[PDB]
Amino acid sequence: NVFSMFDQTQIQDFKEAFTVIDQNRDGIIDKDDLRETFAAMGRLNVKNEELDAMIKEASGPINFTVFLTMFGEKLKGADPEDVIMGAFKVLDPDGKGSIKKSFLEELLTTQCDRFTPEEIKNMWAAFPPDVAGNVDYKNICYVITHGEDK
Amino acid sequence: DAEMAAFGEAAPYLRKSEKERIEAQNKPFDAKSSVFVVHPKESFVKGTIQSKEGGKVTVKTEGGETLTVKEDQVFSMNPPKYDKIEDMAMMTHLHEPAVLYNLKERYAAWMIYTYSGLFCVTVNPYKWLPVYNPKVVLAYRGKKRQEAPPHIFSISDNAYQFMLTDRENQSILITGESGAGKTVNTKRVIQYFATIAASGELEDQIISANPLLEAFGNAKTVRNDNSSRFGKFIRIHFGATGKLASADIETYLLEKSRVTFQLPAERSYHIFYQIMSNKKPELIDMLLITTNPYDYHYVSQGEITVPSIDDQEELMATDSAIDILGFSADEKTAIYKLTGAVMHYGNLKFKQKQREEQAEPDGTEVADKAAYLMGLNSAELLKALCYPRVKVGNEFVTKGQTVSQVHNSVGALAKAVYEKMFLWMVIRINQQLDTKQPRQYFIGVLDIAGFEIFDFNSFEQLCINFTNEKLQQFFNHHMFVLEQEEYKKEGIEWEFIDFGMDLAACIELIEKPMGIFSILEEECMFPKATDTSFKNKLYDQHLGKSNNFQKPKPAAEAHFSLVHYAGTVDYNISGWLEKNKDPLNETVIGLYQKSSVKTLALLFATYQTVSALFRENLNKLMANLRSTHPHFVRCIIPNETKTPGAMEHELVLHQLRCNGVLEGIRICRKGFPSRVLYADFKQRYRVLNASAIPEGQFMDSKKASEKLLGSIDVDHTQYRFGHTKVFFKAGLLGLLEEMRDDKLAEIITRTQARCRGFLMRVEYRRMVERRESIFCIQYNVRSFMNVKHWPWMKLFFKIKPLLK
Amino acid sequence: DEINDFKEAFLLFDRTGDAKITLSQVGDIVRALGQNPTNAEINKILGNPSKEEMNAKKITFEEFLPMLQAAANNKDQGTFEDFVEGLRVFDKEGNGTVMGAELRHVLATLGEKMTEEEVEELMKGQEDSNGCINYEAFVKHIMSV
């Protein structure tokens, strides 16, 4: 599933990300490579159990492919931002100003079995303010592709 | 309401308040049950259908009565939308009852003017109304009859309009029974003309006219005390500009027979009694008569005096009128002198020459007077009379007459002379009513009686009926012509034969050569003919061979019935020969022709029977009527008892048949009566299937109505479209409305549905589209919720930026 | 009963995930599955009995499909003939002329009603600034689904 969405651009973003964590340039990221990438980003308080927890997710040396497979496997239902924006633009169909909370509450719960009312309240809390104001779909897309603080 | 102001005060009698209307048209109605029905005592009363005997019907009444009457003793009832319809011919229910009923309702509401096609029905108020109101006159000025409520000035103005618009002459035909009140209208129409188009930078002459004609063409009938024996035709000659220029009167039937005869309770023309009244004694000596009418057989066969009439007063009225009328004293002298000769004639006596069957004068006492009074020679006169010198072959053969033949010929002249004179007077009147100014068109106003049926129909009846049966055909045609234009304008495909044609049968039988009149006027030439003689000739020639010709069905007496449009008239032939003689002895006429009394001389220059003219005059008339744009007015008489706001049924019903009203409805109901204008069609009925919508709304005022009729469980036959409107049969539009109110529930409810349907049909197209975009959204979020807590993903996150 | 697609369409309007749609949604699902039904007709049979229609269409496909077929029988009334004509009866003044106000109130206040919202939605840019609407085109755009 993890090689089927997954475009060349996404994969290059990942390749560059790997080479930035890959301190030694060897081709395999290890505990040492993780330690000074954390240090270069300002994080000095790193304990071995956290570094080890990271590495334990893979069965072998963390090599480009083992990385790409492990990160794909967690994003099995995740698109690139423009594609996600298209789904909202279809729900927008009139254009420019994004949708209201009620209109999508109902459409996530209704056709099919469930986007559960536990999942949806977590959505209004983790998607915001945004979801209250303009149900800011533009913002929603940028936070899922680019991190939570941004 | 807003509109009405002009009338204001009259309004209530012209139109009803905009809610009175509304409260009437918008009310509960049950078509399938509500109906009109036959009724033994009252003509047609209304009721509700109770049951159904398979071809019998039981109905409740409005008064409370239950009757089981045939299937066709039952007639539908118009939806309330047609309450007090200005034009009954717009009704979707062209019945006999519905017409009676419409008139009646708008009368009980004091509306006397209701239209029935082209007609302008008018009902006798029997009381006073602000209608002839000097405000109204203006109001109706410059208005098509669709811009204003039913009224006579409508007709009268439109005529005028039309007159100048089309550059054609016009006519107005007023007609009704004795008590219908036509003179009143006629007069009223006339004022109208005079007012709205005056160039006196008449009004009396105009008036004074009557009282002359009345002395000569009026008499005490057993019904009226001043019955019209008269009819009339005025030609108002309008100028080029459009301003008044001339007038023209003509008188008809003041009934030649009165001059020589009279029923027992009746009397002859007034004049006679006027003159012998003695208010102007010279006259008596001048004419050489007495003051006792029993000296003049011709004029005292019936009655001599009438309490309600003051012969003395009238004599002057008459007298004075003559003058105003501009007659020369001489003429005014001829008139008198001539009117006395006639009395004298009836005194002319004869006797059988010995051993001969010839007539020889029984004295030269009276002849002398008659002779002098007419500017004749006693002898020459008595000869011509006795030894009529005829011209059989290529010469002039002197013929001898019998006593019976003379008495009858005399009578024929008496009548002949009187008539002619009367005609002349009219002309002379018309002449004054003679200017030099140019004339481009005229508007003829015809006032005459309508077909009246009596248990007793004599000669006079035939003459009148005949007049009317002609007038009728005159209409039926105009309508045929008229109708056919619409179907031509619209583009409908309707073929039909002239509606007049139906009557030609009856007319030919009367006016054609071997027809009644002829047989009548020939026999008048036979010195020894009898009413009985005449009769047989009538039969031998028409009986069995002619359909409209029939022998009376005993039920007074009758000699022959005719089948006129209005019905069967039983005619009694007794006196006819005489009455008709007043065939004319041409020798005598000769003498007249060379009288010392110019006027007398004049009257007979166009040269004889009585019916001989009547016809000539009636032809000259019906010809004048043709070069005219006919405008019709039918006057009605509510109740014999003289009561405002009331109506006997069968009495009004009668009139309607003999009027032409019921025949106009017939002819209407054969084609496509009701015709809806397209927008007028949209608005009112859109609601029926309002959805026959995207293509019915981006739309055309015409193509729409087309498209609309797409729906409904309606006969797609019954209608027909054309360039400006749809054509529809009866009770259809009635059907429409119902749906609308009932008929629209149909129309709407159905148009709603599709919409509803369709509405959701678009929802599915959206739901479906959406199908995946959701999923995308669905799954996509879930990821994040899982990921955002993953080391590796946070890492990528802080790191994702340093990249390029 | 029979055909396949309609069963696929039922799940699209489940809105719970149970494959058991409600007796009220009954009247609406019937409207997009090919052909029109009126509200009064749906309300008449099986609709008028609450417990029976709840146990005869507030249900699985088993009673959906027979109710829908029952409606399928009366649908000959889809005939357009009467339904451009009925409209011309409201505003007839030349072409298929209408006025916005007359169709808007007549199709909200009369017979079966319609919400103002739904009527405004039928008037989706087919009645521009002119006030007058063109009948013949609406029946085509209405019947065009």
Author numbering:
A (entry chain B): 14 to 163
B (entry chain M): 4 to 204, 218 to 571, 575 to 626, 647 to 843
C (entry chain C): 5 to 149
Show me the paper's own sentences about this structure.
The conversion of the chemical energy of ATP into mechanical work by myosin involves coordinated changes in the actomyosin affinity and the orientation of myosin cross-bridges relative to the fiber axis. Differences in A-states and R-states predominately involve the configuration of a long cleft that divides the myosin MD into upper and lower 50 kDa subdomains, the so-called actin binding cleft. Here we report a more detailed view of the rich variety of myosin head forms in the iso-HST state resulting from improvements in both data collection and analysis that have increased the resolution by 2.5× over the earlier work.
Advancements in data collection and analysis for ET since the iso-HST state was first reported suggested that now is an opportune moment to reexamine this state as a reference for HST specimens subjected to a quick stretch or quick release that are currently under study. Adaptation to stretch would therefore require a different mechanism for rapidly placing more myosin heads on target-zone actins. It has been suggested that when a muscle is stretched, two-headed attachments increase by recruitment of second heads to single-headed bridges. Our results show that two-headed cross-bridges exist in isometrically contracting muscle even without stretch which shows directly that this mechanism for adapting to stretch is mechanically feasible in active IFM.
